[PDB]
Amino acid sequence: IINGEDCSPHSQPWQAALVMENELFCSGVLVHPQWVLSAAHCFQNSYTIGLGLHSLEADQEPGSQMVEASLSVRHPEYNRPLLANDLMLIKLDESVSESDTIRSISIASQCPTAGNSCLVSGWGLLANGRMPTVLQCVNVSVVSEEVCSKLYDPLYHPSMFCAGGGQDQKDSCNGDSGGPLICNGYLQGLVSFGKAPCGQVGVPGVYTNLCKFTEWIEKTVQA
């Protein structure tokens, strides 16, 4: 997260950490007591998932859980075309009992509105290139489809939308992939990709356009 701040602890109780070999490589979002939504490009054969975290040390985060998962359902058109449809569902090995620090979030049914202020959170790199010790939060504004489509031509696909890109250089960065973009209290997007370097004036980041996928998400969790 570029030019954000520490989240208030446990203010984003849907945030999931995806870790392997004791290192975070992606986030995800709890969307059901037994299901984490993440970017398909974060796919692994299995996952160690940290829920209820703030720092990444579960022993220092009372109420947190480290759980295992191995069933992934990538979207059936993930990466067709290149970078599109960047979402997958991870089935936890057991349901979590939700709490004030581990809680699912509802997915937006309405598509994003240009100009609206949203929140993105994650443990990815800071403006100084270092990794934060605790979950970071920053506000970014949704950008219009015409701006997104021209800036990311020819890879722009309706499975994508853009947010950020302001002179304030508030943006997502490496390591934030798969984490949430919250708009009006609903899960609107997942961090997907952006042009390098992070935090460029005039370059928004690309987010998975979850309003397009509610049927596939619901059918997958229900099946």
DSSP code per residue over 122-156: ESS--TTSPPPSB-EEEEEEBPPHHHHHHHTTTT-
Phi, psi angles (nearest 5°) of residue 210: -65, -25
**10 known member of a binding site:** yes
Decide: residue 108, CB within 10 A, 0-12 exposed, 13-18 middle, 19+ buried: buried
**Closest-CA residue to 50 (of 41, 106, 38):** 38
**41 assigned to active site:** yes
* DSSP secondary structure letter of residue 68: E
**Closest-CA residue to 212 (of 115, 85, 106, 79):** 85
Strands of 186-193's sheet in order across: 5-6, 136-141, 117-122, 180-183, 186-193, 204-209, 160-164
- The fold of 13-104+214-223 is Thrombin, subunit H (2.40.10)
103 CB-near residues (< 8 Å, 6+ apart): 13, 14, 30
**32 assigned to active site:** no
Cα–Cα distance for residue pair 118/130, rounded to 1 Å: 24
**149 assigned to active site:** no
Tokens, residue 32 = 């059901």
Question: To which H or E segment does residue 189 belong?
Answer: strand 186-193
The neighbour count for residue 65, using CB atoms within 10 Å, is: 18
How determined?
X-ray
Domain ranges (residues) in the chain: 1-12+105-213, 13-104+214-223
Residue 200 DSSP SS3: coil
Q: What is the resolution of this structure in A?
A: 1.6
Cα–Cα distance for residue pair 216/221, rounded to 1 Å: 9
Tokens, residue 152 = 């990311």
Cα–Cα distance for residue pair 195/111, rounded to 1 Å: 23
Name the catalytic one among 86, 104, 157, 159: 86
Handedness of CA 176, 182, 186, 190 (dihedral sign): negative
Alpha-helix runs per DSSP H in the chain: 145-151, 214-222
Cα–Cα distance for residue pair 141/90, rounded to 1 Å: 28
Question: To which H or E segment does residue 92 belong?
Answer: strand 88-92
Question: To which H or E segment does residue 24 belong?
Answer: strand 23-32
Name the catalytic one among 32, 38, 41, 176: 41
CATH code, residues 1-12+105-213? 2.40.10.10
Q: Do domains 1-12+105-213 and 13-104+214-223 have the same CATH topology?
A: yes
Cα–Cα distance for residue pair 1/172, rounded to 1 Å: 5
